[PDB]
Amino acid sequence: IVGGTNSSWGEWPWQVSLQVKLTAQRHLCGGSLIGHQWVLTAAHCFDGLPLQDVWRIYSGILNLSDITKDTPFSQIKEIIIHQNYKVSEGNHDIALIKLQAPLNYTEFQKPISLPSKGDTSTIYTNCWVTGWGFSKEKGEIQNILQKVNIPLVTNEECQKRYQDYKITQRMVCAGYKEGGKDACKGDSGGPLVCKHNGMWRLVGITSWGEGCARREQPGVYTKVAEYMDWILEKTQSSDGK
Ligand SMILES: *[C@@H]1O[C@H](CO)[C@@H](O)[C@H](O)[C@H]1NC(C)=O
């Protein structure tokens, strides 16, 4: 998070940390808890890595340096990457992670409400992006969970900023003309939440940007509302009703 501030215990209780355990354990991505057994994250977090054994999910945590071998974590039972996602490309950057065990809800560990498919037409006004990513371009992983207030930009206004790519109706962009406030590497897969009608809703999944916080270069997010039919279909038990 570039241009952000420290967050408090219980402020973003849905935020999780996706870490890989290879030669050393490192935070790679953010994610949002959406159910007792489900986390929503970006498909690009899994590029060049197996879906099995190497992942650990941390929830109910504010500072990354507090994580030791004693800290309880969630393991992956299944990873569902969008069928149309292509490794190293931008479209459909979304994945669901099914946990091996359900997580009990506390005031520090609870899900973020999902929008409806019809909520695509809604223009939000109080949006925040959180994570432990780089505090500046080419920077380093932050210890304390950062937060930042970022306004949304129209898809047409976002398309003009990225004329070498195609900003689809399945993406939502957020930034300031002067830059200085944006998500960065390590924030990927985390939440872009908006407060609407008194309650918090998951609007975007942090995906990409040309660098971080550059002027007139807004952050691109996977628009959750455009994937609600997919999330609902994929979270069904598999064994059937
Ligand atoms: C975040 O917390 C620590 C001290 O607890 C320190 O890095 C800094 O004072 C805090 N950040 C800001 C922007 O105050």
Residue ranges around ligand 1 (CB below 6 Å) = 5-6, 144
Provide the token pair at 181.
């406030």
The torsion region of residue 140 among left (phi > 0), alpha (psi -120 to 50) and beta comes to beta
Q: Is 196 a catalytic residue?
A: no
What's the CA gap between 41 and 108, in Å, rounded? 19
What's the CA gap between 106 and 43, in Å, rounded? 27
The reply to whether CATH 1.10.357.10 applies to domain 112-225 is no
What's the CA gap between 139 and 17, in Å, rounded? 18
**Residue of 149, 156, 148 whose CA lies nearest to 173:** 156
Domain ranges of the chain: 15-111+229-235, 112-225
Cα torsion through 199, 201, 206, 210, rounded to 10: -70
In the chain, what is the straight-line distance between the N-terminal and C-terminal CA atoms, in Å? 42
The sheet that has 95-99: what strands, in order across it?
55-59, 15-21, 25-33, 38-41, 95-99, 76-81
- The atom of ligand 1 lying closest to the CA of 143 is 7
- By alpha-carbon position, which residue is closest to atom 9 of ligand 1? 6
Provide the token pair at 196.
């609407």
- The atom of ligand 1 lying closest to the CA of 6 is 1
Task: Give the burial class of 3: count Cβ atoms within 10 A of its Cβ; 0-12 exposed, 13-18 middle, 19 or more buried.
Answer: middle
- By alpha-carbon position, which residue is closest to atom 2 of ligand 1? 6
Asked if 15-111+229-235 and 112-225 have one fold, the answer is yes
Q: Is 7 a catalytic residue?
A: no
Residue 131 forms beta bridges with which residues?
146
What's the CA gap between 99 and 180, in Å, rounded? 36
Residue 32 Cα to ligand 1 midpoint, Å, equals 24
> Are the CB atoms for 11 and 147 separated by under 8 Å?
yes
Resolution in A: 1.8
Residue carrying structure tokens 């973003």: 12
Cα torsion through 186, 89, 117, 230, rounded to 10: -100
184-222 burial code (b ≥16 CB/10 A, e <16): bbbbbbbbbbbebeeebbbbbbbbbbeebbbeebbbbbb
Q: Is 27 a catalytic residue?
A: no
CATH architecture designation of domain 15-111+229-235:
Beta Barrel (2.40)
What's the CA gap between 111 and 120, in Å, rounded? 21
Look at strands 76-81 and 152-153 and give their pairing.
Answer: unpaired
Say which experimental method was used.
X-ray
From the CB of residue 102, how many other CB atoms can be counted at a distance below 10 Å? 11
